[PDB]
Amino acid sequence: QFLRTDDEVVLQCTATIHKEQQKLCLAAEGFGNRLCFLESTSNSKNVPPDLSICTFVLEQSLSVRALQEMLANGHRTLLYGHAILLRHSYSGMYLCCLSTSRKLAFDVGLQEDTTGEACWWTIHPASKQRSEGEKVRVGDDLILVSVSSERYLHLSYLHVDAAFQQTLWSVAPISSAQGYLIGGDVLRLLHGECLTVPSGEHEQRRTVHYEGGAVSVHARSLWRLETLRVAWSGSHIRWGQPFRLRHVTTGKYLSLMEDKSLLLMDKEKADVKSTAFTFRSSKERKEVDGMGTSEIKYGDSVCFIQHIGTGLWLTYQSSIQRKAIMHHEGHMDDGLNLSRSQHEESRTARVIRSTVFLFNRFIRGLDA
Amino acid sequence: NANVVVRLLIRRPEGLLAAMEEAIKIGNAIMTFYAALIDLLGRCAPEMHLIHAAKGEAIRIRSILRSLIPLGDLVGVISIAFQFCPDHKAAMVLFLDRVYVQDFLLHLLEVGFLPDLRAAASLTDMALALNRYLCTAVLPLLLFAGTEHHASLIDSLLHTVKGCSLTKAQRDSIEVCLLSPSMMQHLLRRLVFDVPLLNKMPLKLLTNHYERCWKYYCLPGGASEEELHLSRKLFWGIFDALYEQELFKLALPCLSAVAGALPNF
Structure with a gap:
């Protein structure tokens, strides 16, 4: 219904390039990149978007009186005229305007410090249908205004930058229950011993195993769920809705081709019927607009994996190399239990691959 | 008013160093329109004092003025008045x-x-660029090339040594010398070459105005000190020639000031 502080939202502007409604989303990187860019969300049926780099968190929301005071040194609700503080929900930096250039605009990126007028944005309504002072609501196409640069958060032709011209910014809720599954987690897949992808120095690790020992703790066995919905993608997770599984350390999607194999293929090969699996309580709703209710607790769960297009059952075959293959029945051990991870492990996990993909570009540019 | 008009202007659109040059060969529309825009955007300054310094968001417009418009000002401060011409630079x-x-x-x-x-x-x-500029070249009152300026501008000031507006050009030199250091020390006796060529009355006032400030240069570093005596002797004989000495004899006792610090053409 409304938007509060400490919520999870996205910022999303829909442009049109030659009669193609492109719903671009705002995505900052961090850990080596002080500039924002655009994330495609329109073509989500064959190339899934990255979700961890486009969700934000509203931290505080003052009026201009309290901001000009505090600069001069619960869960509140937002009103059109408050200067808010966005922050990157993964990286932990605060979004702001910068004094760099790429025209008479300014560029937009993250910064760590919260003082100054740089990381503050007053919302502006973009209708006569709603006006000053009143309460925010879900899906209101709005404008953002820099407190420092006195400029509008403009989409230009593909720069996102702080300009004198205005553009729309639709928002969408993401999240807001302890011990249950929320779309966006990072978790291991326990067996008794957990699901694994092998060590480096190659295969390109595209095989999938079940293993035991210290590889339970290490950074290989990390999996991120990405549900098919754009808005409310950080809701609860209940049975029957499909979701992609992403390998976090490698950045390749866990894809089943029932003829060929169970492999890991890239974003541009991740088809909605190829890899969107679902768990079932047995081994034999669709969409709710909210964060839902509590479905799956972590230790008391038997999640049986089953495809949409084939409907098979991923069971282990016969190091510990019980390789997972989609069988038609499976044994009584496909009720894989779950174990969510903590924030620092996932924070290391994403930055590992983010540095790997830059070091390899450095290596090949040096060998060229 | 300044603030609101500035924002209004920045919504809309209107190489900005290229337009005043490319139109200069080519009908006086854009070269006057851009100079009027410069005059408007310069009139809406934040302040002229510590209101511009010790306050907030008077600096924001000042940042926007230099952020969308960096200077490139040689297309206006140089190339337009060397044959429209006086006002665009003004x-x-x-x-x-x-x-x-x-x-x-x-x-x-x-x-x-x-x-x-x-x-x-x-x-x-x-x-009539100069009668126009009798204020706006003087208001920048507030040795590498400075020896040229006392060369040139005094050679402009001696063009009248407009009528009562020459008092602005007088203080434009008497205060330009006062912030001197070797070339200006040689310029502390520059009008002595015209004090012998003096005897309108402004030619003697141009001697008297720099006469009192002449000793500050040789007070700091202490050839033509004997020529200063030669000008004092022409002033001692010229004092017998004559409010007639209100600009003359004020410098005559001040020649003891010219003896108190070191020890037309």
Whole structure:
């Protein structure tokens, strides 16, 4: 219904390039990149978007009186005229305007410090249908205004930058229950011993195993769920809705081709019927607009994996190399239990691959 | 008013150093329109004092003025008045003055002022640039090339040594010498070559105004000190020639000041 502080939202502007409604989303990187860019969300049926780099968190929301005071040194609700503080929900930096250039605009990126007028944005309504002072609501196409640069958060032709011209910014809720599954987690897949992808120095690790020992703790066995919905993608997770599984350390999607194999293929090969699996309580709703209710607790769960297009059952075959293959029945051990991870492990996990993909570009540019 | 008009202007659109040059060969529309825009955007300055310094969001417009418009001002401060001509530069000096350090005073120096004493010798229509500029070249009152300026501008000032407006050009030199150091020390006896050529009364006032400030140079570093005696002797014999000495005899006892610090053409 409304938007509060400490919520999870996205910022999303829909442009049109030659009669193609492109719903671009705002995505900052961090850990080596002080500039924002655009994330495609329109073509989500064959190339899934990255979700961890486009969700934000509203931290505080003052009026201009309290901001000009505090600069001069619960869960509140937002009103059109408050200067808010966005922050990157993964990286932990605060979004702001910068004094760099790429025209008479300014560029937009993250910064760590919260003082100054740089990381503050007053919302502006973009209708006569709603006006000053009143309460925010879900899906209101709005404008953002820099407190420092006195400029509008403009989409230009593909720069996102702080300009004198205005553009729309639709928002969408993401999240807001302890011990249950929320779309966006990072978790291991326990067996008794957990699901694994092998060590480096190659295969390109595209095989999938079940293993035991210290590889339970290490950074290989990390999996991120990405549900098919754009808005409310950080809701609860209940049975029957499909979701992609992403390998976090490698950045390749866990894809089943029932003829060929169970492999890991890239974003541009991740088809909605190829890899969107679902768990079932047995081994034999669709969409709710909210964060839902509590479905799956972590230790008391038997999640049986089953495809949409084939409907098979991923069971282990016969190091510990019980390789997972989609069988038609499976044994009584496909009720894989779950174990969510903590924030620092996932924070290391994403930055590992983010540095790997830059070091390899450095290596090949040096060998060229 | 300033703030609101500035924001209004920035919504809309209107190489900005290329337009005043490319139209200069080519019908006086855009070269006047851009100079009027410069005059408007320079009139809406934040302040002229610590209101511009010790306050908030008077600096925001000041940042926007230099952020969408960096200077490139040589297309206006140099190339327009060397044959429209006086006024377009008179807007640009205001835009640079209100919004925009001791290196820059020598940067734009002798740009335009070299044509002054040249075109002053036909006193017409473009020689009313100087009667226009009797205030706006003086208001930047507030040795590498400075020896040129006391060369050139005094050679403009001696063009009249407009009528009561020459008092602005008088303080424009008497205060320009006062912030001197070796070339200005030689310039502390420059008008002695014209004090012998003195005997209108302004030629003697140009001697008297620098006469009192002459001793500050040889007080700091202490050839033509005997020539200063030679000018004092022409002043001692010229004192017998004569409010007639209100500008003369004020400097005559001040020649003991010229003896108190060291120890036309």
